[PDB]
Amino acid sequence: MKIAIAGAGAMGSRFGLMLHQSGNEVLLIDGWAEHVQQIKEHGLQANFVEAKLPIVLQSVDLIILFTKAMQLEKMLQDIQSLIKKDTEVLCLLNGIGHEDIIEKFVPMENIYIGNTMWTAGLEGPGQVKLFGSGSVELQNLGDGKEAAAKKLADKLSESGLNAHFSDNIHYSIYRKACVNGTMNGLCTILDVNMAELGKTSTAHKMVATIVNEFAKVAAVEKIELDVPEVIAHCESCFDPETIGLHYPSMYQDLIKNHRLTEIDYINGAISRKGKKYGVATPYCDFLTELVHAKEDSLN
Amino acid sequence: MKIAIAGAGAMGSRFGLMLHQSGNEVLLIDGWAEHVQQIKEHGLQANFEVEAKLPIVLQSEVDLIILFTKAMQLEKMLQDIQSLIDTEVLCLLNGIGHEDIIEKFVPMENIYIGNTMWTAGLEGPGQVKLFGSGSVELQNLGDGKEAAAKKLADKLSESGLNAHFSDNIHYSIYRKACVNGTMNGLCTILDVNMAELGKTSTAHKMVATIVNEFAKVAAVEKIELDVPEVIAHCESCFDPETIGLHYPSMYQDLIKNHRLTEIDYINGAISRKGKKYGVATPYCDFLTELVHAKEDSLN
Ligand SMILES: NC(=O)c1ccc[n+]([C@@H]2O[C@H](COP(=O)([O-])OP(=O)(O)OC[C@H]3O[C@@H](n4cnc5c(N)ncnc54)[C@H](O)[C@@H]3O)[C@@H](O)[C@H]2O)c1
Numbered sequence: 001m002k003i004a005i006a007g008a009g010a011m012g013s014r015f016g017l018m019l020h021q022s023g024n025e026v027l028l029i030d031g032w033a034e035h036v037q038q039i040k041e042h043g044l045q046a047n048f049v050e051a052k053l054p055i056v057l058q059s060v061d062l063i064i065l066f067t068k069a070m071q072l073e074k075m076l077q078d079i080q081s082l083i084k085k086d087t088e089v090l091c092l093l094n095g096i097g098h099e100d101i102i103e104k105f106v107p108m109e110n111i112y113i114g115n116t117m118w119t120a121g122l123e124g125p126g127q128v129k130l131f132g133s134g135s136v137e138l139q140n141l142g143d144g145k146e147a148a149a150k151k152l153a154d155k156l157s158e159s160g161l162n163a164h165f166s167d168n169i170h171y172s173i174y175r176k177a178c179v180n181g182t183m184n185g186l187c188t189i190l191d192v193n194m195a196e197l198g199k200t201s202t203a204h205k206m207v208a209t210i211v212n213e214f215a216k217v218a219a220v221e222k223i224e225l226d227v228p229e230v231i232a233h234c235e236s237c238f239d240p241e242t243i244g245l246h247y248p249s250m251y252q253d254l255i256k257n258h259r260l261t262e263i264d265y266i267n268g269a270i271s272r273k274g275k276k277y278g279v280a281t282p283y284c285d286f287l288t289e290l291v292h293a294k295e296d297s298l299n
Numbered sequence: 300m301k302i303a304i305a306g307a308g309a310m311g312s313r314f315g316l317m318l319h320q321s322g323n324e325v326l327l328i329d330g331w332a333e334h335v336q337q338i339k340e341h342g343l344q345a346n347f348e349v350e351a352k353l354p355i356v357l358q359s360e361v362d363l364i365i366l367f368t369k370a371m372q373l374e375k376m377l378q379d380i381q382s383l384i385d386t387e388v389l390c391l392l393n394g395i396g397h398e399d400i401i402e403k404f405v406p407m408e409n410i411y412i413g414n415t416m417w418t419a420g421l422e423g424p425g426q427v428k429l430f431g432s433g434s435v436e437l438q439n440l441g442d443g444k445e446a447a448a449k450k451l452a453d454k455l456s457e458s459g460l461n462a463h464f465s466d467n468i469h470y471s472i473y474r475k476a477c478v479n480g481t482m483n484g485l486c487t488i489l490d491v492n493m494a495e496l497g498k499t500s501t502a503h504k505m506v507a508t509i510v511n512e513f514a515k516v517a518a519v520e521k522i523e524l525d526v527p528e529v530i531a532h533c534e535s536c537f538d539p540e541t542i543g544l545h546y547p548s549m550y551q552d553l554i555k556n557h558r559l560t561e562i563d564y565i566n567g568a569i570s571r572k573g574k575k576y577g578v579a580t581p582y583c584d585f586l587t588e589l590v591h592a593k594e595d596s597l598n
C-alpha cells in the first residue's frame with residue numbers, strides 16, 4: 001500500500017512509523033514547518049528507533065487523518081489533490097462528528113471512521129515517545145463497503161496496530177468520547193493524573209453525571225449506551241497498573257505544551273447537540289467553559 | 300458588655316481585638332492548641348503594629364457570644380460551649396443556613412445572623428494581619444427583637460466595626476454567598492486571581508449561570524434577588540484597581556495553606572436546597588464536587 005498520513009503529529013507518527021516498519025510506503029503530510037524540516041534532515045526519531053520517512057508540507061491509496069480536530073478542515077482543503085476516485089479515507093481522531101466535514105471532501109463510499117486506544121507523545125520537532133499497547137476499531141460509512149473495511153482493518157493489523165471491524169462504530173465513538181469527556185477535562189482542570197483523580201471522593205459522581213449526559217444525547221441518535229459498562233470503562237483508567245499514572249492527552253496538550261484542546265469536539269459536541277435535541281447537558285457545558293477559561297488563563 | 304468570641308481565628312481575632320480596644324471584656328474561645336498557648340504567653344500580636352493580652356480558653360472549659368469559626372467547626376464549637384448559652388448569639392460566618400444549627404443550641408429570641416465585609420489574615424499561631432476597611436450587617440431571628448438588633452449593631456459600631464441593622468438579611472446573605480459561590484471556587488480550581496478570571500472568555504457565563512441557580516433557590520424562600528445587580532456585584536471583583544489582584548479567601552484556605560474550604564456551606568447549600576425544593580443546580584453540584592476532588596488531590 002501507498003499510504004499518506006495527513007497529520008503526522010504524535011499519533012500520526014505512531015501509525016506512520018509502524019506502517020513503514022512493516023514495509024509500506026508511507027508519506028507523512030504535516031503543517032508544522034520545524035517538525036517537517038527536522039524530519040527531512042534527520043528522519044523521525046522515536047523511543048519505542050530512527051526512520052527517514054518521506055514528508056511533505058501541506059501547502060497514494062490510503063489517506064489516514066490524524067490531525068487535531070481543529071486543523072482537520074484546513075488539512076482536507078490542502079490535500080484535496082490526493083483524494084482520487086480509488087482513494088480510501090480513514091479518520092481515527094478522538095472527538096465526535098468528523099464525518100460531517102470529511103463528507104464535504106471525499107465520496108461517501110471511501111470514508112471510514114473509528115477510534116484507537118493507542119497512545120503517543122510528541123516531545124519536539126521530529127521526536128516522539130511511543131508508550132504502550134493499543135488497538136483500533138473502524139467501520140465504513142459507505143454503502144455495502146463492509147468487506148473493504150475488513151481488509152483495511154486487516155492491512156493495518158498486519159503492521160501491529162491490532163485493528164478490528166465494527167458494526168456499531170457510532171456506539172464505539174460515543175463510548176470512547178465518554179472516556180475523553182471525563183478523564184481529559186477533569187485531569188486538566190484539577191492538575192492530576194488519572195490515578196489521583198479516581199482516588200478523590202467525587203470523581204465517580206462527576207464521571208457518572210457526565211456519562212449520562214452523553215447517553216441521553218446518544219439515545220436521541222438511536223444509540224443506547226450501556227451506561228454502567230461505559231462508566232466502568234471510564235473508571236478503568238484509574239488503575240495505576242494500567243494507565244493510571246499517565247496524564248491524559250488533553251492535560252499534555254494544554255498544561256504541558258501550552259496548546260489548545262479538542263474540548264469543543266467532545267464535551268462541546270455533546271453540548272451542541274443538547275441544544276439541538278433539547279437535552280440539558282450542564283456538566284459538559286461547564287466543563288467545556290472551565291477548560292476554555294483555563295486555556296485563556298495560560299494562552 | 301461581657302463578650303465571648305467563639306472561634307478567634309483570623310476574623311474572630313479582628314473582632315475580639317477591636318472590642319477589647321474600645322473597652323469591652325473579651326474572652327476568646329478557640330480549638331487550636333498552639334494559637335491558644337501562644338496567646339496566653341505573648342498575647343495576640345497584630346499588624347493593624349499592636350499587642351493585647353486577651354483572655355483565651357481552649358474550647359474544653361458572658362452577655363454576647365460572637366460565632367466566627369469556619370462553618371465546619373461551628374457545630375462542635377456550639378457543643379463545646381453550651382454552658383455559656385439572656386445570653387445573645389451572633390453569627391457573621393460566610394455561608395448560608397447557619398441558623399439551622401444555631402437553633403438546636405440557642406433560643407430563637409436570642410439569635411442574630413449576618414455578614415461582614417471586614418477582612419483578616421492569620422499569619423501563624425498568635426499572629427494576625429488586619430487589612431483596610433469594612434462593615435457589618437445583621438438582623439434578628441426572634442420575634443419582635445428589631446430593637447435589640449439595632450443596639451447590637453450600635454454596640455459593635457462603637458468599637459469601629461461599622462455595623463448596620465438590616466430588614467432583609469436573607470437577601471444580603473444570599474447576595475454575598477453568590478460572590479463567595481463564584482470568585483472562590485472558580486479562582487481555586489482555575490489557579491487564578493480574580494482579575495485574571497474576569498479576563499477569561501467564559502467567566503461571565505459561568506458566573507451568570509451560578510448566580511441564577513442561587514436566585515431560583517432563594518425565590519423558593521420568598522427572596523427575590525436582583526440578578527443583574529448581583530451579577531455586576533460578583534463581576535465587580537474583576538477590577539484590578541479594587542480587589543482584582545487578590546486571590547479570594549478559599550484559594551488562600553486550600554491552595555496556599557492546605558486547609559479545607561467552606562464550599563459545602565455555599566455552593567453545597569444551594570445544592571442541598573435544590574434537592575429539597577426540586578430545583579436543578581448542576582453548576583453548584585459540579586463546582587462543589589470539583590473543589591472537594593481538589594482537596595482530596597492535595598489533602
Ligand atoms: N496522542 C494521543 O495519545 C491520542 C490518543 C488517542 C487519539 N488521539 C487523537 O489523535 C489526534 C491527534 O493527536 P496528536 O497526539 O497527534 O496531537 P498532536 O498535535 O501530536 O498532533 C496533531 C497534529 O498536531 C500538529 N502539531 C503538533 N504540535 C504542533 C505545533 N507545535 N505546531 C503546528 N502543528 C503541530 C502535528 O504536527 C499534527 O499535525 C487527536 O484527535 C487525538 O485526540 C490522540
Ligand SMILES: NC(=O)c1ccc[n+]([C@@H]2O[C@H](COP(=O)([O-])OP(=O)(O)OC[C@H]3O[C@@H](n4cnc5c(N)ncnc54)[C@H](O)[C@@H]3O)[C@@H](O)[C@H]2O)c1
Pocket residue numbers: 306307308309310311329330331334367368369370391392393394415416417418419420421548561
Ligand atoms: N478571613 C477573612 O478575611 C474572612 C472575611 C469575611 C468572612 N470570613 C468568614 O468568617 C468565618 C471565619 O473565617 P476565618 O478567617 O477566621 O477562619 P480562620 O480559619 O482564619 O480561623 C478560624 C478557625 O480556624 C482555626 N485555624 C486556623 N488556622 C489553623 C491551623 N493552622 N491549625 C488549626 N486550626 C486553625 C483558627 O484557630 C480558628 O479556630 C469564615 O466562614 C469566613 O468565611 C472570613
